[PDB]
Amino acid sequence: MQILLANPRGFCAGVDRAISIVENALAIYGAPIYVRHEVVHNRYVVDSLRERGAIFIEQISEVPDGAILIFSAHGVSQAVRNEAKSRDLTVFDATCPLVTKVHMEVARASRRGEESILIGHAGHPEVEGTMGQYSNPEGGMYLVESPDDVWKLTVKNEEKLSFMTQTTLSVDDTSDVIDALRKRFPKIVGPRKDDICYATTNRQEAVRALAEQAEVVLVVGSKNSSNSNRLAELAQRMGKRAFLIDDAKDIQEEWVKEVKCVGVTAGASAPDILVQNVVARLQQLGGGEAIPLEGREENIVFEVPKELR
Numbered sequence: 224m225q226i227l228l229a230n231p232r233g234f235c236a237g238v239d240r241a242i243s244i245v246e247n248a249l250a251i252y253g254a255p256i257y258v259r260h261e262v263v264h265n266r267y268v269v270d271s272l273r274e275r276g277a278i279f280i281e282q283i284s285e286v287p288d289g290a291i292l293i294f295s296a297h298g299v300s301q302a303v304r305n306e307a308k309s310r311d312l313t314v315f316d317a318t319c320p321l322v323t324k325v326h327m328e329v330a331r332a333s334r335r336g337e338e339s340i341l342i343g344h345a346g347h348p349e350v351e352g353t354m355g356q357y358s359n360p361e362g363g364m365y366l367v368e369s370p371d372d373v374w375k376l377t378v379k380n381e382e383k384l385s386f387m388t389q390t391t392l393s394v395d396d397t398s399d400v401i402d403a404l405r406k407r408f409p410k411i412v413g414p415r416k417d418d419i420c421y422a423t424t425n426r427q428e429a430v431r432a433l434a435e436q437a438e439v440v441l442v443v444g445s446k447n448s449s450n451s452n453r454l455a456e457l458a459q460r461m462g463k464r465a466f467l468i469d470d471a472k473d474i475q476e477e478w479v480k481e482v483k484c485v486g487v488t489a490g491a492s493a494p495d496i497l498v499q500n501v502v503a504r505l506q507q508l509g510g511g512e513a514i515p516l517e518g519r520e521e522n523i524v525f526e527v528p529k530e531l532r
């Protein structure tokens with residue numbers, strides 16, 4: 224069985240930064256370090272960090288006075304940030320720079336009391352942090368997930384309207400929602416295309432090329448990783464059986480029985496060691512040397528804050 228690896232796959236720069244932030248805080252200050260929400264959505268990364276003395280909470284009221292608190296890569300609402308500020312806490316912010324970019328625009332529209340529409344998935348922490356940057360009651364902040372949501376939205380002043388997106392969405396589904404927003408709201412202002420980040424776009428482009436060759440695609444990533452779910456869905460849409468799996472243990476041998484080419488990719492929050500364990504397990508099940516596909520280069524690194532060297 225031939226094993227092909229997608230490229231790019233795995234850690235993007237925001238993830239690598241957000242984990243280094245927690246690891247370095249642990250090294251500088253010692254346990255416990257509180258983290259608001261899983262620092263990235265990967266069980267292996269979260270369980271490791273917990274075992275080293277990170278405590279992951281959802282609310283700032285779970286954090287004791289005097290504690291060091293890290294916001295997760297996904298970002299947090301102004302309300303959360305203000306609640307942390309109004310408390311005793313030393314805060315470091317692991318929000319990905321490319322989420323912070325979107326937050327700044329939503330803050331700009333709110334100061335204008337102009338309405339804004341976010342494209343994203345309800346209940347995702349990034350969507351909460353981003354919808355949470357809008358506070359002006361004079362305007363409004365609306366969430367849509369699909370063309371049908373656009374088709375039911377009414378806004379106060381369609382002449383002064385802008386949109387933003389979640390960073391990890393399907394590039395193709397988002398394009399549909401945007402075409403619907405511009406048909407419904409012809410004066411709507413947005414980015415050139417969307418706020419999908421380079422790593423999301425590139426891993427989707429890479430999983431498309433992988434699915435073109437592979438009969439089955441394994442996407443290493445946790446059930447709650449938005450971006451990892453989009454890679455699996457993309458392959459499934461191309462007619463390939465695709466599974467989202469945390470680790471090599473999850474691989475059922477039926478999935479690869481008498482399959483001649485299996486592809487492996489990993490979401491932006493999954494460590495490369497998980498991919499290497501998955502490859503070792505497909506080799507036990509009949510696969511040969513893992514071949515990486517040729518892929519678009521990524522060269523971006525985001526450094527930890529200087530306080531955390």
Ligand SMILES: C/C(=C\COP(=O)(O)OP(=O)(O)O)CF
Pocket residue numbers: 237238262263264265296297319322349390391447448449450451490491492
């Ligand atoms: C892509 C992203 C973080 C890296 O991924 P995850 O932590 O899996 O988060 P998700 O895709 O669920 O937003 C946004 F911070």
Ligand code: SF4
Pocket residue numbers: 235236237238296319320321322390391420421422423450491
């Ligand atoms: S997927 Fe994109 S926005 Fe999210 S942490 Fe990674 S580089 Fe940043």
